[PDB]
Amino acid sequence: VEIX
Amino acid sequence: VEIX
Amino acid sequence: YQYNMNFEKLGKCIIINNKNFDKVTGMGVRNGTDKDAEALFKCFRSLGFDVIVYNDCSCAKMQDLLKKASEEDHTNAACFACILLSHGEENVIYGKDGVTPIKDLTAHFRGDRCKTLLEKPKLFFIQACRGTELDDGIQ
Amino acid sequence: TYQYNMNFEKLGKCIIINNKNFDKVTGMGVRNGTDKDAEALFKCFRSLGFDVIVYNDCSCAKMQDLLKKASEEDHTNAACFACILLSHGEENVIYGKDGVTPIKDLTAHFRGDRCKTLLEKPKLFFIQACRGTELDDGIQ
Amino acid sequence: YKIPVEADFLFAYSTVPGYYSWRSPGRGSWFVQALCSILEEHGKDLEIMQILTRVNDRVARHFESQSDDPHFHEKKQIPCVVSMLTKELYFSQ
Amino acid sequence: YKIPVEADFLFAYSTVPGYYSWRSPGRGSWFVQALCSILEEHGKDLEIMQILTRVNDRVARHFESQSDDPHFHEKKQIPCVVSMLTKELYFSQ
């Protein structure tokens, strides 16, 4: 999972 | 009337 | 006690789906955002919104899109909805060319600047970061 | 399973900070009418079932310490927590009689990791204060 | 297992960010007047968002400033609710 | 007579101010996943604050990050609803  |  | 929904249309729903960004911004590709936008498209379509999805918008593009919508005639609409999918930082959202303030995007729909949405709900949904803190959770 | 569990011995604590008078150096005037607010509020929240406490003309350090201590208390038998702030303010910030302090710093004491006995319990903050200098001209 | 540390907060501001908030020396602040009024008659039977929404409505409709200074004359106010709640909140039953 | 210019707005942010927001490349962002799930099964029969509150709950409970970087491992998220609405909002009838 990544971050915006 | 006044303001905070 | 409830907003009057007895109108011809539920209203317009703008989805801004920003995936790819100019390298000058230093921001990476937002993989998965297409799955978001499609799912959002179906849901809000199902609610009764007239949905349009715009992709990889510049700041001026985003500014123009919302400005134009505020100038449209919403007399037969119950409400307005806007969905923003992008990178972001506190108080601001990324176009592909950089950042623009969220307040500037939404101010177009103020009562004095959009009379046909007066006393009607104006909804903004924002998937974006708002800074760099993490939430460690507990228990 | 969609509503907060209210089955506790107590509803909870309600802290009211009633700031009326300010050190002149802050440039802030006396907040006349705030006593009626505080009187109206304690009566209402007492009626709800809260254990209400009223503090008057608090310094910034007073406000910080006060909320800190309350966060360190044992809320295991309480359904929720409430705090009401009545003062001058500016964006993101609230006035003590001593100057300004950030709202976030006041409320952060009650974060889940810093007040475990209010975990999964609602933490309510009611804020009567200015948040800048813009006016709302209205329409229609 | 875990829960976020910022969860289960609710902030009922008297006004929106960037703006003033109004206070009658005789009757008390608009927001508090409305909040207490509505809590008196619906505190025990309405959910917290329903209460604060009605508070929003009352401050918005029932109130308008008067000053001899035209810069402060006939101005309006809208409160602002920030919710990190994970459940509905009733103060009863 | 008058109505405030900032009234009848609602902001459903995916996260609280100052914080990151999470996104799975395969399944989409946490907030949108939760929003769509809840809208799909309750969009037309629940009030908007009830909807977004359930979204808050699901994002808070059902989701937890995994990274090989320990700085980003096992992190959590809570969304943030800002309401200047003056009425209850249902998407039907």
XYZ file of C-alpha atoms in Angstrom:
473
model
C 0.000 0.000 0.000
C 1.077 3.576 -0.756
C 0.326 7.121 0.389
C -1.323 10.033 -1.361
C -23.372 42.591 19.206
C -19.628 41.841 19.372
C -17.163 39.325 17.921
C -14.894 36.676 19.357
C -35.598 18.965 8.603
C -34.532 17.345 5.337
C -33.185 18.908 2.143
C -35.875 19.013 -0.548
C -35.068 16.283 -3.077
C -38.086 16.807 -5.329
C -36.250 18.002 -8.438
C -35.855 16.688 -11.992
C -32.224 15.811 -11.366
C -30.216 14.749 -8.331
C -27.420 16.884 -9.713
C -24.057 16.982 -11.447
C -21.176 14.889 -10.121
C -17.648 15.784 -11.183
C -14.909 13.217 -10.622
C -11.337 14.423 -11.021
C -9.122 11.361 -11.359
C -5.480 12.452 -11.300
C -3.147 9.511 -11.930
C -0.130 10.790 -13.850
C 1.915 13.823 -12.850
C 4.488 16.106 -14.440
C 7.965 15.090 -13.242
C 8.547 18.696 -12.118
C 6.038 18.028 -9.327
C 8.124 15.066 -8.197
C 5.002 13.007 -7.522
C 4.643 9.330 -8.442
C 1.940 7.465 -10.363
C -1.196 6.859 -8.284
C -1.852 3.208 -9.150
C -5.303 1.980 -8.148
C -7.008 5.333 -8.676
C -8.753 4.066 -11.821
C -10.413 1.338 -9.771
C -11.512 4.070 -7.349
C -12.922 6.311 -10.084
C -14.854 3.513 -11.794
C -16.336 2.316 -8.500
C -17.227 5.895 -7.605
C -18.726 6.371 -11.063
C -21.089 3.413 -10.590
C -22.090 4.291 -7.016
C -22.854 7.957 -7.680
C -24.506 7.051 -10.981
C -26.660 4.634 -8.989
C -27.590 7.433 -6.589
C -28.857 9.408 -9.575
C -25.991 11.799 -10.283
C -25.023 12.810 -13.808
C -21.384 11.787 -13.495
C -18.435 12.902 -15.634
C -14.839 11.806 -14.999
C -11.926 14.040 -15.962
C -8.418 12.563 -15.998
C -4.968 13.958 -15.183
C -6.130 17.555 -14.881
C -3.839 20.549 -14.565
C -4.452 23.085 -11.797
C -5.961 25.554 -14.262
C -8.069 22.738 -15.701
C -9.389 21.835 -12.252
C -9.976 25.521 -11.534
C -11.816 25.957 -14.835
C -13.938 22.801 -14.468
C -15.322 23.868 -11.085
C -15.703 27.503 -12.144
C -17.741 26.444 -15.186
C -19.955 24.158 -13.092
C -20.699 26.979 -10.651
C -21.836 29.099 -13.589
C -24.191 26.413 -14.933
C -27.913 26.495 -14.121
C -28.697 24.125 -11.244
C -32.329 25.237 -10.881
C -33.636 21.730 -11.583
C -30.967 20.009 -9.484
C -31.313 18.837 -5.884
C -27.590 19.116 -5.153
C -24.029 19.153 -6.467
C -21.213 16.674 -5.865
C -17.496 16.779 -6.600
C -14.952 14.015 -6.061
C -11.212 14.681 -5.972
C -8.729 11.826 -6.400
C -5.085 12.922 -6.284
C -1.898 13.622 -4.381
C -2.106 16.390 -1.814
C -0.784 18.298 1.174
C -2.632 20.244 3.881
C -5.186 22.666 2.400
C -4.024 21.896 -1.153
C -4.466 19.355 -3.938
C -2.226 18.364 -6.845
C -3.011 18.931 -10.465
C -0.605 17.223 -12.841
C 1.370 20.484 -13.059
C 1.473 21.265 -9.317
C -0.703 22.278 -6.360
C -3.821 24.412 -6.039
C -5.744 25.344 -2.873
C -8.868 23.326 -2.118
C -10.661 26.423 -0.807
C -10.287 28.099 -4.221
C -11.881 25.093 -5.917
C -14.906 25.123 -3.606
C -15.373 28.888 -3.188
C -17.028 29.033 -6.618
C -20.082 27.356 -5.091
C -20.571 29.843 -2.260
C -24.113 31.194 -2.016
C -23.234 34.608 -3.415
C -21.344 32.992 -6.309
C -23.821 30.268 -7.284
C -27.467 31.189 -6.604
C -28.933 28.076 -8.245
C -27.317 25.907 -5.570
C -28.468 28.173 -2.743
C -29.935 26.199 0.185
C -28.849 23.045 -1.641
C -26.111 20.700 -0.417
C -22.683 21.033 -2.025
C -20.668 17.866 -1.483
C -16.912 17.438 -1.821
C -15.203 14.064 -1.406
C -11.404 14.193 -1.221
C -9.022 11.240 -1.430
C -5.618 12.854 -0.909
C -2.906 13.326 1.705
C -3.090 16.296 4.070
C 0.437 16.258 5.463
C 3.071 13.755 6.531
C 2.071 12.427 9.961
C 1.368 8.729 10.444
C -1.195 7.142 12.751
C 0.416 4.363 14.780
C -2.876 3.122 16.199
C -3.260 1.407 19.563
C -4.309 -1.804 21.371
C -23.496 -2.171 16.733
C -23.989 1.165 14.969
C -24.302 3.290 18.106
C -21.771 4.128 20.820
C -22.305 2.004 23.924
C -23.942 4.206 26.560
C -24.161 1.485 29.209
C -21.795 2.950 31.798
C -21.987 4.062 35.416
C -21.541 7.674 34.320
C -22.203 9.598 31.098
C -18.922 11.432 31.586
C -17.053 14.586 32.528
C -17.923 17.951 31.002
C -15.269 20.649 31.314
C -16.226 24.254 30.610
C -13.516 26.873 30.173
C -15.188 30.256 30.603
C -12.716 32.956 29.583
C -14.153 36.448 30.046
C -11.269 38.694 31.084
C -7.936 38.973 29.295
C -4.575 40.596 30.032
C -4.575 43.920 28.171
C -1.258 43.054 26.473
C -3.168 40.475 24.408
C -5.206 43.350 22.989
C -8.390 41.391 23.629
C -11.509 42.945 25.133
C -13.801 41.646 27.866
C -16.151 39.008 26.434
C -19.483 40.220 27.824
C -22.286 37.676 27.513
C -20.007 34.685 28.094
C -21.390 34.222 31.620
C -24.869 33.606 30.204
C -23.310 31.100 27.823
C -21.547 29.292 30.665
C -24.690 29.363 32.814
C -26.841 28.066 29.945
C -24.300 25.354 29.105
C -23.710 23.906 32.591
C -27.486 23.651 33.092
C -27.992 21.874 29.751
C -25.085 19.442 30.112
C -25.918 18.738 33.755
C -29.422 17.898 32.545
C -27.948 15.460 30.017
C -26.167 13.609 32.824
C -22.644 15.039 32.655
C -20.457 15.746 35.678
C -19.966 19.414 34.837
C -17.052 21.595 35.953
C -16.681 25.300 35.149
C -13.321 27.091 35.000
C -13.100 30.877 34.686
C -10.472 33.207 33.148
C -7.839 30.525 32.589
C -4.262 31.136 31.503
C -2.842 29.124 28.606
C -0.827 26.959 30.994
C -3.920 26.529 33.163
C -5.917 25.306 30.158
C -3.121 22.970 29.006
C -2.550 21.459 32.456
C -6.269 21.176 33.185
C -6.994 19.157 30.040
C -3.809 17.134 30.562
C -4.845 16.098 34.073
C -8.346 15.186 32.908
C -6.834 12.980 30.204
C -4.787 11.202 32.875
C -7.861 10.470 35.012
C -9.607 7.091 34.851
C -12.608 7.246 32.502
C -13.266 3.491 32.558
C -16.760 3.957 33.999
C -17.658 6.871 31.702
C -19.513 6.665 28.378
C -17.853 9.750 26.883
C -15.991 13.011 27.469
C -17.012 16.593 26.704
C -15.142 19.896 26.698
C -16.512 23.357 25.954
C -14.247 26.300 25.162
C -15.535 29.864 25.451
C -12.968 32.507 24.512
C -11.351 34.697 21.904
C -9.553 32.881 19.125
C -7.879 32.959 15.743
C -7.511 30.210 13.124
C -6.289 26.948 14.740
C -5.729 28.798 18.013
C -7.574 29.798 21.210
C -7.008 32.573 23.744
C -6.164 32.152 27.357
C -6.036 35.376 29.336
C -2.288 34.931 28.886
C -2.155 34.713 25.094
C -2.888 32.040 22.492
C -2.526 28.245 22.446
C -3.296 25.765 19.603
C -6.584 23.821 19.696
C -4.724 20.693 18.576
C -2.427 20.777 21.601
C -5.420 21.013 23.932
C -7.245 18.082 22.324
C -4.209 15.880 21.620
C -4.122 14.915 25.310
C -7.186 12.770 24.625
C -5.798 10.822 21.658
C -6.334 7.073 21.908
C -2.715 6.317 22.756
C -2.662 9.102 25.372
C -5.989 8.489 27.090
C -6.633 4.765 26.936
C -9.672 4.887 29.233
C -11.557 6.953 26.641
C -10.615 4.609 23.805
C -13.527 3.818 21.465
C -15.495 6.494 23.310
C -16.625 9.790 21.776
C -14.585 12.867 22.683
C -16.608 16.026 22.153
C -15.229 19.543 21.872
C -17.529 22.548 21.509
C -15.717 25.737 20.565
C -17.171 29.232 20.822
C -14.395 31.462 19.484
C -13.377 33.403 16.388
C -11.246 31.674 13.761
C -9.995 34.653 11.777
C -11.293 38.004 10.575
C -13.488 37.264 7.557
C -17.156 38.253 7.614
C -20.125 36.498 6.029
C -22.207 39.011 4.070
C -25.073 36.606 3.412
C -27.394 36.477 0.405
C -31.041 36.607 -0.766
C -7.145 -5.276 16.453
C -5.943 -1.666 16.431
C -7.762 1.668 16.383
C -6.457 5.023 15.097
C -5.352 7.536 17.735
C -7.275 10.380 16.091
C -10.526 8.405 15.941
C -13.716 9.167 17.902
C -13.200 12.931 18.050
C -15.902 15.470 17.257
C -15.432 19.222 17.017
C -18.404 21.572 17.071
C -16.994 24.952 16.072
C -19.176 28.049 16.319
C -18.021 29.182 12.889
C -16.133 28.141 9.759
C -12.339 28.561 9.492
C -11.076 32.057 8.687
C -14.184 33.780 10.028
C -15.383 35.754 13.042
C -17.930 34.452 15.529
C -20.696 36.602 16.972
C -21.672 37.248 20.583
C -24.516 39.238 22.120
C -23.548 40.820 25.475
C -27.213 40.611 26.456
C -28.152 37.132 25.244
C -24.835 35.326 24.840
C -23.174 34.014 21.682
C -25.362 32.868 18.778
C -23.867 29.370 18.639
C -24.312 28.704 22.363
C -27.855 30.130 22.323
C -28.778 27.746 19.515
C -26.898 24.770 20.966
C -28.560 25.083 24.368
C -31.998 25.776 22.886
C -31.900 22.625 20.756
C -30.325 20.445 23.464
C -33.103 21.506 25.847
C -35.774 20.151 23.487
C -33.975 17.279 21.725
C -30.889 16.375 23.767
C -32.289 13.017 24.849
C -33.940 11.856 21.613
C -31.702 13.026 18.746
C -28.342 11.817 17.430
C -25.450 14.257 17.848
C -25.183 15.106 14.130
C -28.932 15.756 13.931
C -28.607 18.105 16.891
C -25.642 20.017 15.471
C -27.225 20.190 12.015
C -30.287 21.856 13.517
C -27.868 24.124 15.395
C -26.290 24.993 12.049
C -29.719 25.803 10.610
C -30.768 27.991 13.546
C -27.570 30.047 13.645
C -27.796 30.462 9.877
C -31.446 31.548 9.780
C -32.374 33.128 13.130
C -29.372 35.455 13.428
C -28.122 38.626 11.743
C -25.785 41.305 13.105
C -26.469 45.009 13.618
C -23.718 47.597 13.930
C -23.496 51.344 13.372
C -20.246 50.503 11.624
C -21.486 49.421 8.161
C -18.467 47.116 7.860
C -20.034 44.928 10.562
C -23.686 45.541 9.686
C -26.159 42.817 8.647
C -23.552 40.033 8.612
C -24.202 36.295 8.957
C -22.699 33.172 10.536
C -22.547 29.414 9.899
C -21.070 26.914 12.371
C -18.822 23.993 11.457
C -18.892 20.366 12.578
C -15.843 18.121 12.278
C -16.535 14.454 12.956
C -14.093 11.595 13.421
C -16.773 9.533 15.166
C -17.096 5.858 14.244
C -20.632 5.401 15.610
C -23.907 7.245 16.126
C -24.138 9.103 19.433
C -27.260 9.340 21.563
C -27.061 10.773 25.088
C -29.785 8.461 26.408
C -31.211 4.907 26.870
C -34.235 36.706 5.016
C -30.510 35.993 4.628
C -28.406 32.842 4.351
C -24.640 32.547 4.974
C -22.440 32.163 1.889
C -20.472 29.281 3.419
C -23.585 27.308 4.402
C -24.731 23.940 3.007
C -21.227 22.637 2.308
C -19.968 19.185 3.249
C -16.412 17.903 3.004
C -15.705 14.197 3.274
C -11.928 14.010 3.546
C -10.210 10.632 3.404
C -8.060 11.590 6.389
C -7.552 14.113 9.192
C -5.419 17.254 8.714
C -1.654 16.754 8.948
C -1.832 13.063 8.060
C -1.173 10.691 5.168
C -3.898 8.804 3.307
C -3.523 5.219 2.116
C -4.019 3.568 -1.276
C -3.769 -0.039 -2.472
C -2.716 -0.225 -6.170
C -4.679 -3.453 -6.623
C -7.871 -2.658 -4.736
C -7.932 1.142 -4.539
C -7.681 3.646 -1.690
C -9.077 2.701 1.729
C -11.534 5.612 1.890
C -13.025 4.995 -1.570
C -13.297 1.231 -0.990
C -15.217 1.882 2.219
C -17.328 4.682 0.744
C -18.426 2.576 -2.228
C -19.178 -0.517 -0.143
C -21.358 1.543 2.216
C -23.009 3.501 -0.598
C -23.717 0.305 -2.535
C -25.744 -1.233 0.331
C -27.131 1.889 2.057
C -26.836 4.856 -0.323
C -30.576 5.407 -0.706
C -31.828 4.576 2.807
C -29.350 6.236 5.193
C -28.720 9.904 5.965
C -25.373 11.174 4.662
C -23.801 11.624 8.119
C -24.827 8.069 9.024
C -23.232 6.898 5.785
C -19.960 8.753 6.335
C -19.870 7.674 9.983
C -20.036 4.019 8.949
C -17.312 4.820 6.411
C -15.241 6.231 9.268
C -15.749 3.014 11.241
C -14.786 0.700 8.376
C -11.674 2.673 7.421
C -10.645 2.718 11.082
C -11.254 -0.983 11.736
C -10.979 -2.991 8.508
C -7.692 -1.445 7.331
C -4.040 -1.578 8.396
C -0.922 -0.823 6.347
C 1.896 -3.216 5.567
C 5.329 -2.052 4.468
C 8.804 -3.567 4.668
C 9.898 -0.135 5.850
C 9.207 -0.203 9.620
C 8.396 3.522 9.540
C 5.322 2.700 7.433
C 4.445 -0.700 8.905
C 1.104 -1.434 10.617
C -0.248 2.122 10.342
C -3.878 3.208 10.623
C -6.231 5.822 9.167
C -9.338 7.772 10.177
C -11.274 9.952 7.720
C -12.692 13.384 8.491
C -16.125 14.850 7.814
C -16.700 18.605 7.783
C -20.348 19.638 7.717
C -21.852 23.075 7.192
C -25.152 21.457 6.230
C -28.385 22.929 7.569
C -30.596 19.903 6.909
C -30.553 16.114 6.911
C -29.609 14.698 3.510
C -31.194 11.623 1.931
C -30.492 10.612 -1.679
C -34.056 9.455 -2.384
C -37.774 10.206 -2.721
